[PDB]
Structure formats: structure tokens, C-alpha cells
Design a protein around this ligand. Structure first.
Ligand code: ATP
Ligand code: ATP
Lengths: 668, 668
């Protein structure tokens, strides 16, 4: 096994899995019942991903229901059935629903009612934020943040012991509902990836092939991330591609098939479980089957620019804020900071209706194209002063969400960035769509409008959402698939692709890192990035760190050592492994002895010749590299193979050692 | 560079690319114009993929137009404008169109007219098949087959010198139009991947960063395969995922973005260029926005079974036929075999209207749901004898396509398998859909129909197409994305996922290889597979082949050798590389000397000390592995890193060499 905060050596896990397969095949021939058991062991992967999908579907549904209920609880309660949210009672004047101004002051409208509603909205936002931050701080500090930056590192081979446990799962679910209902600039769509990975890790223990294997566990977590995205956006294929591109790290075509199955199971559960018949794939779905004209692809591209100019700004601003908190008085007061952020968000969001709306419903509104019956300020046409006032409201919502999400992403409560960035993009896209429609029917004499309503601002809102989401995240295929799986509009894919590449390029013009890589670099997690390349001209001899300043390379001789000597080496040295060599002078790589395996073997024996025997645990095949090998090659070895150590050699004479951590330290 | 039919060592190419980048950066600081040139060199990749997308769009459009024209030429000609196909003149009784019975016999209907149409259809099928096979045999033998099995090997690092040249491109385009119009059981959708790769390879030469680099060329070919799929199915994301899953081999997240851009460019070209306003994304598009009920997912799964039972049968039957041809008299007569196949297909396909229809229009018909105005035999409702007769016709078409595609895939003309397998699946799905609809409105009293027309056979045809396509190809995410990008129905995704997984599982029950892998094993191409694992328990010492029966390991000493000695080694030995060592006794790995580089350097010098100097070409960093390393590890090294040789060592004493070909020979 592995110690806390320690990396996973992928090759050793793969080898162990191979011996397990060999032993299972040996037991298989024993009896027909053993053949059935071997078949069950084979199905284990499908069963674990199936359970993960069912759990992710159930938990996403429960979180949606609870979050909607407690979000609407900020404006009032239902008298008929208290367990119904605003919409659930509207269709179930709206006499049933009663606001807090109605319950306390007794009069629905008037300055008194507005002030009472303002005060009660702020109070409930503070209460939900307080409960979320307090529960996270007390019972599970790992439940804060979206969590994707850390599952990226966990799928890279890193280990965070309690990160995907039961306590983190429970507290993240509860505190995510609370934070969503608190009115903070965040969403649960991102955090459902963490919740799905929690379910996957929890269910891995039910199976032996995945309980004791960290590589199989990583594969199950990749499938679980796919399921989490699938259930968050109703985007099975989009979730598969998100796990392909964002979170998971290796894909030997088996993780792809099992992510396919896990996303399928999650999507099927989400379809079967429709407690109130909400056909909307998620609360911010909007159907689309209208066509678009080539000229429209010009403004779409510009939306990408905004996204690239927002993402780029966000990664430059939020990452600068989170540093200050981490290195100032602010970082000493999690609860107080969440309280102040929630209070300010409530105070400055209650006035403007768009900011008052919970972000998912705001994105639903911005995506939905105007209908003749609708007369909301968003689709309020004579045009006249009303349209300009609506555009001004949308601009204010844009500015407010930008500023607040900058200050609100990293706070210590479950906080997503898919929905705030998506809403910023949708506000941008809707403003642009309204502007283009005004231009269209005011200047219809121009050839572009003369030859080809003519334009749907909902499509522009979709494209702006994709633009900002790709600018901040830097996701291309997963993001587009997620967007048209979310919205169902598989007729606007080319516009989405144009916006997403434009946003990614404009974002990369200011720095190639996304928000999930910048909250890995900022947190100093040990993540070896594939995008980054060892541009430095260096040799493996430099990076390897048995340096002249360092002590002698800790090693073990094959037969000279005694039990007491190796036990002393275990206790007095923190190293997790030792190169087992022929002799202190021969320095011939005989194998690699793991500190945990050595300790366990010695303890079991008490409760030395590597040729107390210790050949059972000896790693006869340690990966080696020439001392003159260029370092970039070693970086590629580590990245493609996912090794933990590579024992450099010099003309066959053991020269030292390199570890993933050594490369990561050097690359800083 | 590399010799014909020789593999690509990915690490050496990657390193060379690094030195090219370093030199470009050095030149960059020279002047601002050099900064502009460096920026152009960076854009080179986007420009090459853009050109590839434009070319693929243009060529796919031209091939569609020409193939439709020549296919309809089998039934007659248009008098108004001879350059119009049947449909182009129907909307442009249909007096304009005149069949060959009309032109020759002068009678539209009657036994004489029917016999004359029979004879002329057969004659034109023979003529087109003859021209296709003859042109391929004479001018470009590489234009035969779908070609995907070979681009799979080319993207793996193999080299086939003329395979993606200009002659292969031209002849494949022409002979693909001819084969499509010949009425053979095939399609052009698959071969457009080969055509797109041809365009990508052709355009790579316009850029130096991609002309002289085989790894960059492979990346451009991955993007080109994405573009080819995108333009073949109108499925840009589907093409990106097809290149992810089927053809291309490595994805350092840059090939993903450039495949994204190439698919975007191809899709945009296909959208812009609509010469006759055919909104159908391809001639066999069908819109879908209706819902499906959970019970319908039961028959869908069964369709997958059929697909898995067809794919499985096909890989068992066709691969058995192609072997016989390759090892019997049949393989000596390409032209005669194509003639006989075309004649039999025409003779047995003219009677049944569904087989008479070109497969793309047949799939369009099977996908299209019945409309009240339509009264075709496919949607001929009173029900009565007509429905049973239509089902019988569909069964006959199913049997005929199965049998013929088995005998018709491998013949020496451009032959795809996406469309024949898709049509078999669509016939199966339509038969099942009609059966289920009859069951639905005859037995409406059952609770499944009582609670929830009620069923669309077009959706069942979609699902059956996906079932058979995944059974034969064994593609999961790419196939589903292609299907709902092709049809636009991003509301039936879960049924497609379920049918595709069922088909893949049932197919794997009879053998895990698809059709593009069984035509690599059958052709004996040097393809190292990720799905396959070295289940054999063996050590690298066994696989390495400087065996006791083999001669001494050809090696070079660093300084002792003279120019004449190394030239003699070059001429008398066919090896492409030599381990350069310290001495014939020291056997210390100093580096690796490539035969081509050695020959070129010696020739240039005439027109030795590796410490005529030859340190410029010496590979100071040859990948090495311990002689006791398990062979599974070495296989993983080769597969993940894509090396060509791994110089095994024994306690630092050079022990031998292993090559990709050595591993492939052993795995046989
Ligand atoms: N057996 C060893 N002999 C000498 N130096 C070693 C040995 N093992 C590791 N080192 C050095 O110690 C540092 C890393 O030691 P260690 O193996 O404990 O890894 P780590 O970076 O703490 O990570 P992990 O927790 O994954 O093991 C690096 O400087 C490495 O060069
Ligand atoms: N320098 C060498 N000394 C001894 N045996 C060698 C040497 N190079 C290759 N071999 C052996 O010769 C066979 C392969 O030789 P070679 O290097 O020509 O490769 P190949 O399989 O023909 O492929 P490629 O065309 O890609 O080089 C294998 O048996 C390999 O063990």
C-alpha cells in the first residue's frame, strides 16, 4: 500500500494486478464454481461502475431537490405542502406561496414588505453560508472548493487519504446544498464530479480487484468522474470526454469503455428518476432546432474572445486573491470570510432580479428564446426604454458575477465554477444577441439581413457560456459536447467549436494554464503536467539528488545486511524505498525494496539474504536510466509510464535515484 | 529519415523536434522579421490542418456529387441537363428523366422494358466495377480497400511510402466514385478517412516543421482522419473521437486540439458548400426530436445483440474469405474477381428495390419515419398482406447484404464497411421497429402500451445501425457520437449507448478483435496493440535476439573503427542501427548509430572517432533495459513511448538489442 500524500507508482500496481490475474486464473481451473467466481471477478469492473452511476444519479437528484428547496426558502414558504419549492407550489397570484414579508409584516407589497424581504433574504443567505462553512470546517475540511483540482491530482497517481471518503462525501453533499442555497457565486455541477468520485472510491472497497489496487481504483475514479459530469449536465458522452480531457490521466481503452458504461448508467438513472416530470435535462436546459446563418459565426467568434478575455482575467485575478488569503490574516478566518462574502453577495444581489435568481434559473432564462406570452424584463419588447433598461440590468449582473465569483471561488465551502462562468458567458451572449437582433430589424436593408425573427439570442447565450467556460477551463471537445448535451442543440456545434477555440486561444495569449491547473500550481500539489515541457537543457545527472551536499545514497546489499541493520535503516530513514545492490562497492542494481513492504515483512517474521529471506518483496525490475540521459527523456518516462522512481545508473554502476517529487521540485 | 516499410521511433523524432524548436528560438531573437517567421512556424500546425479540412470538404463534396450522378446513371439519363442525377431532375411522371429501356426499347413499362433495364443495370455495374478495379490495379494498387486498417498502422508509427501519396489520392477518389456507382456492397464514408489522410500528408510538405518530422506528420494525420470522418458523416465531434479511439495512437492533448480544429474546418466547409441546398447533413440524415419510453430500451438492447452477432460473424466469415483469396487461385485475378462480384451483386440486387437502391439512399429511407403522404412499400399500411410482404423484402435485403458484403469487402477496389454494416443494422432495426409497432397497436391492452403512433421504426433503425457498426468495428463513444451527429438525434443517446455496449459485448464473446484489427492480423502488418497484453510469462533476455544461434551482436567501437570498416559494416549488414560501444570487450553503451545517418555522413565526408568525427549523428541516449526485466515491462515501454529499439543490458554490459519488429514477431 501507500502512505498519505504519496504518489502511486503505476508500473508496480500494473504488475501486482497481473499477478492477481494469474492467481485468479490458477484458481479458475480448480472447479466450475471457481470459473463462476472468476467470471464474477471479471464483471467486478462493470458492477462497480454501475453502482457508482446509480449512486451519482441518486445523489445528484437529491442535491438538486434540496438545493432548489432551500434556495426558494429565501423568498418564502408554501402553506399547502411545506416541502414544496416556489415552482412546485405555483402549478400544484399564487396564494399558496407566502413570502417572509407576508408572514411577518402581513402585506405582500410596499416599502415595508420590500425591506422585510431584503432583510430576510440577507439573513437566510448568511444562515446557509454559516452552516455550510461551519460544517465543512468542523466535520470535513476537504469538502471545500469544487474539488476538481484535487481529483486531477488523485487521478494523476497522487494520494489524499480522506479526500474521497464517506465523511467528505456526506459533508460535501450537505454543505453543497447549503452553499448553493446561500446565494453565493457558485454551483453544484462541478462539485458533483467530486461527489461521483467519492461514490466510486466508496464502492471500490466492495470488490477486491479494485480495493487493494490503486491503478484500478484510478480507473474506477475516471469512470466516476465521467458519471458525475454526466449526471451534472445530463451529458453522458460529454462526461466521458470530460474525464478523457480534464480529470483522468491514463486511458488504455478500458477506462474509456468503463467511463462509457458509467456515464450511460448515470444518464439512465437520471432519466428514470424524474420525480416531478422535469423533462429539462437539467434546470438550465433549452431545446434548439432552428438554423443559423454563416454571418452569425462572426459575432460568435467575438464571444469566444470575451471568454478568453474573461477566463484569462479570472485566472489572473482569482488566483491572485486566493494567494492573498493563503498568505494574509484573511486565511486565519474561514467562517468569518464566508459570512462576509455571503452577506455582501446577498446585499448586492437582492436588488437586481437576475442576480437575485439562483444561477441555474438565470442560465435557463438566458438560454430560453423569447416567447410571445412571456413578458419578462429579459424579453420585454414594445423597442424602447425597456430594452435599454434590460440591457443595463444584464450588464450590472455581468459585472456583479465577475467581481463576486473572483472573490468567491476559493472560500471554504463547496464551490463550483461551471455555473458562475457559464452564467457570465450567458449574460454576455444574451447581451450580444439582443444587440444583434436590434441591429437586424433596425438595419434590415443591409445585405446580410436582407438576403438570409432572424436571430435567436438564446443561441448567442449558449455560445457565450461555452466561450467563457472554455476560456476559464480551456476545454475544447468535452466543453462543446457538454454544452449541446446540456441544451440538446446538436445543430449549433460549429458555432460552439468556433467560440471555444477562439476563447482558448485568447486565453492562452495570457497564459496557457486553466483554472484547475492554476489551483494545483497555487496549492502546490504534486501534479506532473503533460502540457508543460522540460524546456530547460539539462541532463539526468543534475536532477538526481544524491548530490555532493547530500548524504550517501541509502542502499542495501543483497546478503551482507542483517535484520537489525535493515530495521535501523527503516526507522532512522524516512525514505520509502532502497536500491538493493550486490555490495557497497559493486553497486549493481539487484532490485528495489519498498520501506512499507520491508517493515511489514520484518514485523511478520518477528511476530537477511535477498538472494531472513526478503526476495518475496524485492523489486527485481527497477526502472533505470543512464546518467547521461537528457532529463526531458526521464520526464517523458515518468509521465507516460507513471513511475515513482527511476534509479539512474552510470556505466552499470548505481549512481543514484530520481523520484516524481524530485522532478516536480526541479520544475519549480 | 526512414526507409520503406520501416517503423517510426517516436522518441528520436520528438528530440529532433526539440532541437528544431531550439534553433528556431535562436533565430527568433535575430530580428523582428524573425519573430514574425517564428510566429508563422507556430501557426504552421493550424494552417496545415486548415488546408486539410478545406481539401477534405471539397473532395468529399465532389465524390458525393460524382458518385450520385454515376449511380443514377445506371437507371437512365436526364434530357434537360445531362449533368443532373435522378433527383436533381425530378424537382428541376418525370418526363425529363429517361431510362435505358425508354432510350433503347422506347417503352417505359412492359416485360421488354424490364428485361432491358435489367441488362443495362447489370452492364453499367460491370462497367463501373471494371473501371475501378482496372484503374486501381494499374495506377495505384494502394487505393483498394477502405484503407483504415493501414492508416491505423501508419498512425502507429509504421511507414508505407506511397500509401498516402498523390497517385493514391487521385486513383482512390476516381475508383471510389466508380465502386460506389458500381452497386457493390461498399461505401465511401470509410474511404474518406484515407482520402483525408492523403490530403494531410500532401499538405504536410508545404511546411518544414511537419515535412521532415514523422511524429508531427502523424499528428497531422490524426487531425486529417478526424476531418475525414467529420466530412464523411457531418460529425465533427464524432470524427475527433473516431481519431481518438480508432485510428490515431498518441494524444498529448495537442493532437486533440488540432483534431478539434481540423474537424471544425471540415464541418464548416461542408456547411458552406451546399451546391444544391441539401440540408441533410449527409444523404442519409434524418432529424429526430421525439421522445422514447423506458420499455423501448429492452428491444434496443436486443438489437445490440444482433449487431454483436453480426459483427462477430462478419469478422469470422469475411476474414476467412480474404485469407482464401490471399492463398488460392482467386488472389491471382483481381479484375476478374471484381467483375464477377459486381455481376452477381447487380443480378441479385436489381429485383429487390431495397437492394437496387444505393445503400446511402436505403439508409436514408430506413432512418426516415413514415409520413402520411408517403406510400412506399417500406411504409405501406392499410395492416395486411402488404406489411408482411414489405417485411419479407427487408429480410431478403438483409440476407443479400450480409452475404455480399462478406464476399465484397476485401476486393481490390475502394471499399468501405461503414455503410454496408450500417445498412444491415438499419434493415434489422426497421424490421424490429415494424414488428414492435404492430405489437403496439394490435396489443394496446398491455400495460406497457396502455400506460405510456407510439413507436418510431426510424429510431429502431438508427439503433440497429449503431448496433451492427459497433459489433463489427467495436467502437463505443466515437460510434455513438457519429450516429447522433449523422442523424441529429441527440435525444436518443442512451439507447445508442446501450445498443453499442451490448453489440460490443456480444461481439467480444466470440473474439475481441474488430474488423480493422483482423485486417492487420490477416495482412500481417506490424501493429503493436494496446488491447492485447503479453500474457506470456517471459523475460526480456529471451525475446532479445542476438541468440546463440544468431551471429555476434553487430556493434561499433567508439574510436578503434576506421571509415572503411564502418562502410563495410553498412554495406554488408542490412541493420538500420548499431550500438556504438567503448570497446569490443568493455561493451559499454556509448550511443546508437543509425545506418542511414552513418551512410549519409560518410558519403558527405568523402564527397573514425565517435568521441572522421561521427559524434554529430551518434545517439548518446539509447533506451536501455535490464536483461532480467520482464518482457511485459518492455512491451509497455515500446507501446507507451513508441520506441523502435531498446538495447538490453546485463549488469551494464551491453547484452543485445530488441526492436518493435522483434516483439511483434514473438507475439505471433
Ligand atoms: N534510497 C534513497 N537513497 C538516497 N536518496 C534517496 C533515496 N530515496 C529517495 N531519495 C531522495 O530523497 C528525496 C525523495 O525521497 P523519498 O523516496 O522519500 O520521496 P518523496 O519525494 O518524499 O516522495 P514519496 O512520499 O512519494 O516517496 C529525493 O531527494 C530523492 O533523491
Ligand atoms: N545492431 C544489431 N546487432 C545485432 N542484431 C541486431 C542489430 N539490430 C537489429 N538486430 C536484430 O535484427 C532483427 C531486426 O533488425 P533491424 O534493426 O534491421 O530491424 P527490422 O526488424 O528489420 O526493422 P526496421 O526496418 O524497423 O529496422 C532483430 O532480430 C534484431 O534483434
Amino acid at each position: 500500500t501507500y502512505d498519505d500524500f504519496h504518489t502511486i507508482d503505476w508500473v508496480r500496481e500494473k504488475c501486482k494486478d497481473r499477478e492477481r490475474h494469474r492467481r485468479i486464473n490458477s484458481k479458475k481451473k480448480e472447479s466450475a464454481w471457481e470459473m463462476t467466481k472468476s467470471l464474477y471477478d471479471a464483471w467486478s469492473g462493470w458492477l462497480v461502475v454501475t453502482l457508482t452511476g446509480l449512486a451519482s444519479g441518486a445523489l445528484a437528484g437529491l442535491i438538486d431537490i434540496a438545493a432548489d428547496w432551500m434556495t426558494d426558502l429565501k423568498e418564502g414558504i408554501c402553506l399547502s405542502a411545506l416541502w414544496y419549492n416556489h415552482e412546485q407550489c405555483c402549478w400544484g397570484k399564487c396564494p399558496q406561496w407566502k413570502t417572509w414579508a407576508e408572514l411577518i409584516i402581513g402585506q405582500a407589497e410596499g416599502p415595508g414588505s420590500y425591506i422585510m424581504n431584503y432583510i430576510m433574504y440577507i439573513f437566510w443567505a448568511l444562515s446557509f453560508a454559516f452552516l455550510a462553512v461551519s460544517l465543512v470546517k468542523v466535520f470535513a475540511p476537504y469538502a471545500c472548493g469544487s474539488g476538481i483540482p484535487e481529483i486531477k491530482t488523485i487521478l494523476s497517481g497522487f494520494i489524499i487519504r480522506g479526500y474521497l471518503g464517506k465523511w467528505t462525501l456526506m459533508i460535501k453533499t450537505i454543505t453543497l446544498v447549503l452553499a448553493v442555497a446561500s446565494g453565493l457565486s457558485l454551483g453544484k455541477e462541478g462539485p458533483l464530479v467530486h461527489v461521483a468520485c467519492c461514490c466510486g472510491n466508496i464502492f471500490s472497497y466492495l470488490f477486491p480487484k479494485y480495493s487493494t489496487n490503486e491503478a484500478k481504483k484510478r480507473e474506477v475514479l475516471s469512470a466516476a468522474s465521467a458519471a458525475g459530469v454526466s449526471v451534472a449536465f445530463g451529458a453522458p458522452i460529454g462526461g466521458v470526454l470530460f474525464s478523457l480531457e480534464e480529470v483522468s490521466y491514463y486511458f488504455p481503452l478500458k477506462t474509456l469503455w468503463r467511463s462509457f458504461f458509467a456515464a450511460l448508467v448515470a444518464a439512465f438513472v437520471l432519466r428514470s428518476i424524474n420525480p416531478f416530470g422535469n423533462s429539462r435535462l437539467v434546470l438550465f436546459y433549452v431545446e434548439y432546432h432552428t438554423p443559423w446563418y454563416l454571418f452569425e459565426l462572426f459575432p460568435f467568434i467575438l464571444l469566444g474572445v470575451f471568454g478568453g478575455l474573461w477566463g484569462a482575467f479570472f485566472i489572473r485575478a482569482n488566483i491572485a486573491w486566493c494567494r492573498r488569503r493563503k498568505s494574509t490574516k484573511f486565511g486565519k478566518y474561514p467562517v468569518l470570510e464566508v459570512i462576509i462574502v455571503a452577506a455582501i453577495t446577498a446585499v448586492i444581489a437582492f436588488p437586481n432580479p437576475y442576480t437575485r435568481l439562483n444561477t441555474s434559473e438565470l442560465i435557463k432564462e438566458l438560454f430560453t428564446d423569447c416567447g410571445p406570452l412571456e413578458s419578462s424584463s429579459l424579453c420585454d419588447y414594445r423597442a424602447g426604454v425597456g430594452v435599454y433598461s434590460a440591457i443595463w440590468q444584464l450588464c450590472l449582473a455581468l459585472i456583479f458575477k465577475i467581481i463576486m465569483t473572483v472573490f468567491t471561488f476559493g472560500i471554504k465551502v463547496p464551490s463550483g465554477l461551471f455555473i458562475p462562468s457559464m452564467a457570465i458567458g450567458a449574460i454576455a451572449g444574451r447581451i450580444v444577441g439582443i444587440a444583434v437582433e436590434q441591429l437586424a430589424y433596425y438595419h434590415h436593408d443591409w445585405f446580410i439581413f436582407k438576403e438570409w425573427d432572424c436571430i435567436t439570442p438564446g443561441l448567442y447565450a449558449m455560445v457565450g457560456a461555452a466561450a467563457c467556460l472554455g476560456g476559464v477551463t480551456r476545454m475544447t471537445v468535452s466543453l462543446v459536447v457538454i454544452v449541446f448535451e446540456l441544451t440538446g442543440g446538436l445543430e449549433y456545434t460549429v458555432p460552439l467549436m468556433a467560440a471555444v477555440m477562439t476563447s482558448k486561444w485568447v486565453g492562452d495569449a495570457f497564459g496557457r494554464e486553466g483554472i484547475y491547473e492554476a489551483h494545483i500550481r497555487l496549492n502546490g500539489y504534486p501534479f506532473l503536467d503533460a502540457k508543460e515541457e522540460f524546456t530547460h537543457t539539462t541532463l539526468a545527472a543534475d536532477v538526481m539528488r544524491p548530490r555532493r551536499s547530500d548524504p550517501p545514497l541509502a542502499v542495501l546489499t543483497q546478503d551482507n545486511m542483517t535484520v537489525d541493520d535493515i530495521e535501523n535503516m527503516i526507522n532512522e530513514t524516512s525514505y520509502n524505498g532502497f536500491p538493493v545492490i550486490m555490495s557497497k562497492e559493486s553497486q549493481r542494481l539487484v532490485g528495489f525494496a519498498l520501506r512499507r513492504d520491508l517493515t511489514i515483512a520484518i514485523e511478520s517474521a518477528r511476530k537477511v539474504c535477498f538472494a531472513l529471506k526478503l526476495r518475496s518483496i524485492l523489486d527485481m525490475s527497477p526502472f533505470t536510466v543512464t546518467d547521461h540521459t537528457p532529463m526531458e527523456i526521464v520526464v517523458d518516462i515518468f509521465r507516460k509510464l507513471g513511475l515513482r522512481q527511476c534509479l539512474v545508473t552510470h556505466n552499470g554502476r548505481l549512481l543514484g535515484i530520481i523520484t516524481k517529487k524530485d522532478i516536480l521540485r526541479h520544475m519549480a
